[PDB]
Symmetry: D2
Subunit: 405 residues, 4 copies
C-alpha cells in the first residue's frame, strides 16, 4: 500500500478509532443518564493513543482493559457499557473505510483530470484502432483517452452512491437488540451515530455483511478498469509499437487480480449464520484492508503514469502506414463509389486489397494498376482516400461529448 | 434457471432483439436521409422472428443475411449500415438485462412483502440468538425477519441505481467512432437510443465491460443474502432444532456459489485490450445468462419458502429453556445489581451458573440455594428474572423501525 | 465444448452410464444370491438406452422407474437394490470423467507432438526474448517452444497421478455404510467395482469431494498453460510484430477464465456437511461438465493452431534489429574486455549504448566513434559482436534437454 | 499464521536463502573455473545474515548482493551473482521455503491422521444419527465419521508427495532462460547448483511457467477444503441443541479455507504470463503464496489441536437418536416383517404405521404393536429390537477396519 493508505489501516490508527468510539459512547450514555458524568469525563480524558502500552488475543477488550486500569478511582469501569466487541471493530472499520475512500476520491479526481487533459491535447492525433491486437481502423489517441474518462466517471458515481449505505453505525450489542441497555439502547445507538457522523442503523448487521462486500465489489470494478489502462499502455509501450512511453503499470495487474478474488471471498462471507459468526468476520478482517491497500497501489501508479505519460505521434503515424493503406479500404470503397459503379467500387477495391496484401504492396499501387481506376480518377485524389488521417471518423465530436458533463 | 427467466435469455428472444434493433436502425437512418425511405419500409417488414429459418452459425450476421436475402428488390442491402456485430449483441443484452431485472424487482417485492408479514406476525415469538451456532441471548423471531427485510430493501436500492447506467445503448461501429456514418454517426446513435428507450452512451464501451460487471457484482451481493437466508432456515429446520419448517433451500446454496465465482470471471473480463476483444466478451456472453438463471432460481425458491414458511414458537420455547435460565443469566446479574452491588452481583451469578452447569440444574434453584440471594430477593422475581421471555430487549421497537420506511 | 466431449456429458450418454451401472449391480447381487438369477438376467436385458422414453425431477429414479415398470413379470423390482441415488450419479460421473480424460490425454499427445516438432524444426531461429513486453536478449523460437513442451509434459504427469484416485466407485447407500445390504454391502461394493473397472473405495465419499475437486484444479492448471500459449501467439501475431500467424486463440482466454473461476466453486463445494448434502453436490453437478467442455474447447483450438502454426523467421530477425545492436550489449562487453580493459570495456560500451539510444543510431556506429575502440580492433569483428544472432546462448542444448 | 510457519516466510529466512544460493553459485562457478577460487572464499565467508544491515531498499535481491559485494575485500566480490538474474534467486529461494513449509505440513498431517486413527477405533461402535441436509437419515457410528475424514487426509498426503518431486526444482536460467553470459558453462553451472542445493535440475527455464507454484496453491486449496468440512462438522456437532461433541477454534479454520481457495484462483490466474519474464504474474505469486501458506498452517494447527482434545459425549448421540422414537430405523422394521409378511407388503404397511406414530408423536414400537397382523406374526421382544437404532448400524466397524489397515 501507500504511506497514506498503509497508515489508515495501521494499528495505531485502528485503536485510535477504538478510543474515539469508547469516548463517544461514554459521552452518549452520560447524557442519557446511564453512567455518571464525572466517570465519563475521565473515560474520555484517557482515550488518547499516546497513552497505550503495546502489550503482546482480544483486539478490543485488550484496549478497554488498559483504559479501565488507566482511569482514576475505577471510573474507567463505566466504559464499553452494553456494547459488544464486534460493535467496536465494525464501526471502526466503517470509520476506516471512509478515510480510505477519501483518498480514492482524491486519486480518482487526479486520474480524471489527467485523462481530461490527454483527451484534449491528443484530440486529433491519429492512430490504429486494434481489435484482438490486430489493426482495425483509424482513431485518435484522444478518443482512446476519452473512453477511459467516461469509465472512471461511472466509477465515481458508484463510489458516491454506496457511501450513503456504508457510512452506517454498528451498535447492536450481543444479539443485535441491546438487551442489557434495555429501552435506552435505541437512544444510545442513535446518539452514538450522530456522535460519530454516521447514519443510524435500521437494524443490526453483525451477520449481514452486504455493506462491506459492496465496498469490495466496487474496489474490484475500479481495479478492473485500472488494469485495462495498464494493459493498453504496456501494449502501446512495446518495443515493436512505441506509440507511448511510461514515466509501474505492470504492478496494477497483481493488485486487480488480488482484489477481484478478494471480493469473491467477501461475497462468500455474506453467507453468515444467525446473529454472529467468527469465520465470516475474519474473512472481512483480512481481505478488506488488503483490498484497500492493493487499490491504492493501483490508483497511485495509475495516477502517476498518466500525469507523466509520453505520447509519440510519429510512432503512431508509422504504425498506421504498416497496412500501406489497406486499413482505410472502407474509405476508398465509399469514395470511389461515385465515379465507378457502386457494385464495382466494392468489388474492385476488395479484389485490389487481396492483390496488394498477397503482394505486400500499397493499396494505392494496386488500385492504379486497374485501368478503369487509373482512367476515371487521378492519383492526387486516389491517394487522399488511402490516407489513414482522412478516415479518422467523427471522434473529436465524441471526445467533446465526454468532456461536457 | 426458471421458465420465466430462461425465456428472456432464450435464442428466440435474442434474435427477437436483433430484429427489433435492426428495424429501429432502418427507421432512424431513413429519417436522417442515410438510407432510402422505401428500403426501410421493407427492412422493418421482415423484422419478425416468425420469418427466420433456424439453420444455425454466426450470432448476428446469420440473421442479417436472412433479412437481406428476405428483402425483395435488393432493399436488404441497406440494413445494418455503419453498425458492428457487437453493437447488435450488446444492445440486445442491455434489453435482456432490463427484462431480467423486471423479474428480479417483482420477486424482491414478494420476498420483501413476506418478510414484513413475518416480522409482525412473529414479532413477539421469542427464540435464542445464536453466535457460532452456540446460544447467546434471547431475541424474537420477528427481530430476525426484520434484519433480512432491512437488507433486501438495500438490495432494491442498489438495483435501481445500476439500472440508470446499464440501460445504455451500444452503437459505435468498428472502433466506436462510426466512421462509415461520417457526420451522421452521433445523429444516428442518439436517434437509435431514443428509438429503443435506452440512454445514449457518452462514448463507445465495446471493451469497457464495467456496466455488465456492475450487474454481475449485484447478483453476487443479492444471492449472498439469499444464501444466508437459506442457511438460517435449514439450520432452524434441523431435526434437533425444529424451530421452523419449509413448505428447497439447499438449491439456493449452489446458486450463491456459482454466481459469486461467475462475478469474479466478469471482473476478470474487465481487463480487456484496446478497442475490441473476443474472449472478454465471451466470458460475459457465457456467465451473464448463467448467472441470471441461477439468481432467478434462488429468488423463486426464497420467495416460495417464505410465503409458506412454517414457524413453531413451541420449538423456540423448548430450545430456549434448555439452558434452564443460563441464557438469561445476564438479566439476573443486573437485577441483583440494584439490591447488591452491580459488580458484586455479576461475580455471584457467574458462580451460581457454574454450579447449575456442573449440576445440570435450573439456575433459579441454584440462585435460591444461595441464602444472600434468597434474602435480598424473593422467589417470585428470581423466577421472573430467569424467564427468557422477559429479557428480550427493545426488539419490537427495532422491528417497527425497519417497517417505517 | 466440442462434439466429442459434449456428447460424453449428454443426457443420452449419462443415462447410458446409469443403465450400465444398474445392470452390473443386478448381476453382482444376483451372483451373491441377493436377488433371483432370472430377475437379474431379465433386468440387465432392459438396460438399453434405446428402450427409454426420452419424453420423460429425479435424475436417476426417473430412469429406474422406466426399468422397473418395463421388466416382465415385475422382475424389475430387484434393480437399484440397496443403492442410493447419489451412488448412481457419482459413479456415472466418475465413468464420464474417465471418458473425458481419454480425450484430454489424446489432445496432450497431439499438442506435445506438435511442440516436439516445432522445437526441433525451429531449433536455431533467433528472435528477441521479451520481459514485460519489452525486448531483452536473443533466443531461438524452438527454445520458446521447448519451455511450453516441458510444461505440457508436467501436466501429463499430473493427469496420470490423479487417475488412480479419481477412478473409484461410489456405492455407500444412504449413510455410506449400506445398512439395508447388511453384511453383503462390502461384498456387493467390491464386486461392483470390478464389474465397472473401478477401484473400490476405502470408505464412502458422498460428501468427501476431494476427488472431483482435484479434477477441477487440474483442469485449472492445464487451461492455465493453454491460456499463456494463446497469449504468446496473439502477441507474436500482432500487426506490428508479425512473428507468427494463426491458421482462434482468443477463445482460450475465455475457456481458461471460466475454468479457473469454476475450480474455485468446486473448492468451495468441498465444505460439505455431515454424511450427505444437496447444494455442495449441486455445485459439482453443474461446474464439472462445464469445465470439461471449456477445457476441450481450449485443447481443441490449441491442438489445431499448433499443427497449422505459421513461423516467419524474417519478421523475427527484423524485430531483433529494432534495438540497432543494443540488445547484445552484454555480448559486446565480454568480447571487447580482452582487447581493451575489462572495467573500461564495461564502462565504455555502457556509455556508448546510452549515446546510441538517445541518438537512435546503431551501437556499432557509436562504438567506432570512440577512438580507442576504432584503433585496437577493426570493424569486421566489431560487427560480429553486434550481431544479435551470435548471442543465442545454450538454447539448442536446452532444447535437447526437453526432448531428452 | 504459526511462529514456525510465520518464520519460514520471514524476511530473515528469505535473505538467508539468498546468501545460501549466492554461496553455492560462487562455489560451483569457481569449481568450474568460471570465477576465481580466491574470490569464492570471500563470497562464501560473507554469506552470513548476521553481516547484513537491515537498510530496507525499495530491489529485493540486489539490495543484498550489493551489501555482499561491497562487504568483500580486494574487489573479489565482483564475481558473485554471475550469470544469475534477480528472479533466479527469488524463485529458487521460494522453492527452498516451500520445502520447509511442506515439512511442517507433513508433520501436522501425521498428528491429524494419528488422532483420527485413535478416534475411529475408540468410538468405533459409538452410535449416532447420519444427517443428510442437516436432517436425520439413518444410524451410523462416530468412528465411521472419523474414518471418512481419515481416508481423505491420507489421500491429501499422497498428493503432497507427488507434487514435491515437481516443486523441488532449481531456478537458474539467467535473463531469458538461456544463460547467455555463462556461455557453454551455463548448463554445467545450473546442474552443479541443483546438486549443491539438493534440488532437482530443471529441464528448462520456468520464469513464466508458474505451473509448479500453482500446483502447490491448488493443493493448499484442496487440503484446507477438507479442514473446512471438519470444522463445520465439529461446531455443527457442538451446537447447543446437538451437543454430540465438544471442543477443548474451528470457526477460524473456516476463514482459512475461504481465503486459501480464492488465493488459489489468483495463482491460477498468474499462470497467464507473457513471454519470457513478467512482473505482476510474479507479484501475484509473491503475495498470495506466503499468505496461503500461513493460512493453511493456522488451519492445520487448530485442526490438529481440536482433534487431539476432542470431547465426545456418546449419551447425546443416543439422546438425539431416540428423538425420532424409532422412525430413524424404520427401514429395519420393514425388512424384519418382510420375511413373515413379505418385503413389498411390509414397507407399504410400516410406512402407514410411521405416519400414525409421527402424527400422534408416539413411539414406532407402540403403533406397530397396535396392528394385530404385526403383533401376531412378530413378538414384542424383536419388534423392540428392530426399533432400536443400535441394531441397524450396518457394516461400519468393517469399513473402519478397511480404512485402518493401510
Ligand atoms: O525484480 C524481480 O524481483 C522479479 C522480476 C522482474 C521482471 O519481471 O523483470 C520477475 O518477476 O521476473
Amino acid at each position: 500500500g501507500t504511506p497514506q493508505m498503509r497508515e489508515i489501516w495501521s494499528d495505531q490508527n485502528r485503536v485510535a478509532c477504538y478510543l474515539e468510539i469508547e469516548a463517544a459512547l461514554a459521552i452518549v450514555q452520560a447524557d442519557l443518564g446511564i453512567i455518571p458524568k464525572n466517570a465519563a469525563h475521565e473515560i474520555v480524558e484517557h482515550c488518547r493513543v499516546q497513552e497505550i502500552d503495546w502489550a503482546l488475543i482480544y483486539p478490543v477488550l485488550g484496549i478497554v482493559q488498559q483504559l479501565v486500569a488507566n482511569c482514576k478511582d475505577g471510573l474507567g469501569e463505566y466504559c464499553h457499557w452494553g456494547a459488544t466487541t464486534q460493535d467496536i471493530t465494525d464501526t471502526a472499520t466503517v470509520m476506516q473505510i471512509r478515510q480510505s475512500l477519501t483518498l480514492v476520491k482524491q486519486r480518482l479526481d487526479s486520474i480524471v483530470s489527467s485523462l481530461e487533459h490527454l483527451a484534449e491535447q491528443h484530440r486529433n492525433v491519429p492512430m490504429a484502432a486494434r481489435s484482438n491486437l490486430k489493426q482495425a481502423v483509424p482513431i485518435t489517441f484522444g478518443f482512446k483517452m476519452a473512453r477511459f474518462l467516461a469509465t472512471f466517471r461511472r466509477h465515481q458515481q458508484r463510489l458516491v452512491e454506496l457511501e450513503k449505505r456504508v457510512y452506517t453505525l454498528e451498535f447492536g450489542g450481543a444479539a443485535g437488540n441491546l438487551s442489557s441497555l434495555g429501552d435506552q439502547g435505541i437512544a444510545t445507538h442513535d446518539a452514538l451515530a450522530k456522535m460519530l457522523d454516521l447514519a443510524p442503523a435500521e437494524i443490526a448487521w453483525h451477520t449481514e455483511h452486504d455493506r462491506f462486500a459492496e465496498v469490495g465489489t466496487f474496489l474490484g470494478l475500479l481495479t478492473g478498469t485500472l488494469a485495462k489502462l495498464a494493459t493498453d499502455i504496456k501494449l502501446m509501450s512495446q518495443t515493436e509499437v512505441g506509440e507511448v512511453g511510461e514515466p509501474s503499470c505492470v504492478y496494477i495487474h497483481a493488485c486487480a487480480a488480488n482484489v477481484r478474488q478478494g471480493a469473491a471471498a467477501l461475497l462468500d462471507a455474506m453467507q453468515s449464520d444467525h446473529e454472529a459468526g467468527t469465520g465470516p468476520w475474519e474473512i472481512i478482517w483480512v481481505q478488506l484492508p488488503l483490498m484497500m491497500n492493493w487499490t491504492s497501489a493501483a490508483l497511485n501508479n495509475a495516477d502517476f503514469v498518466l500525469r507523466g505519460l509520453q505520447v509519440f505521434p510519429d510512432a503512431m503515424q508509422h504504425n498506421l502506414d504498416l497496412s500501406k493503406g489497406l486499413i482505410v479500404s472502407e474509405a476508398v470503397m465509399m469514395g470511389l463509389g461515385n465515379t465507378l459503379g457502386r457494385q464495382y467500387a466494392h468489388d474492385a477495391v476488395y479484389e485490389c486489397c487481396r492483390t496488394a496484401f498477397v503482394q505486400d504492396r500499397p493499396l494505392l499501387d494496386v488500385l492504379l494498376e486497374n485501368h478503369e481506376i487509373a482512367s476515371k480518377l487521378d492519383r492526387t485524389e486516389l491517394e487522399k482516400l488511402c490516407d489513414p488521417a482522412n478516415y479518422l471518423g467523427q471522434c473529436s465530436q465524441w471526445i467533446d461529448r465526454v468532456l461536457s458533463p
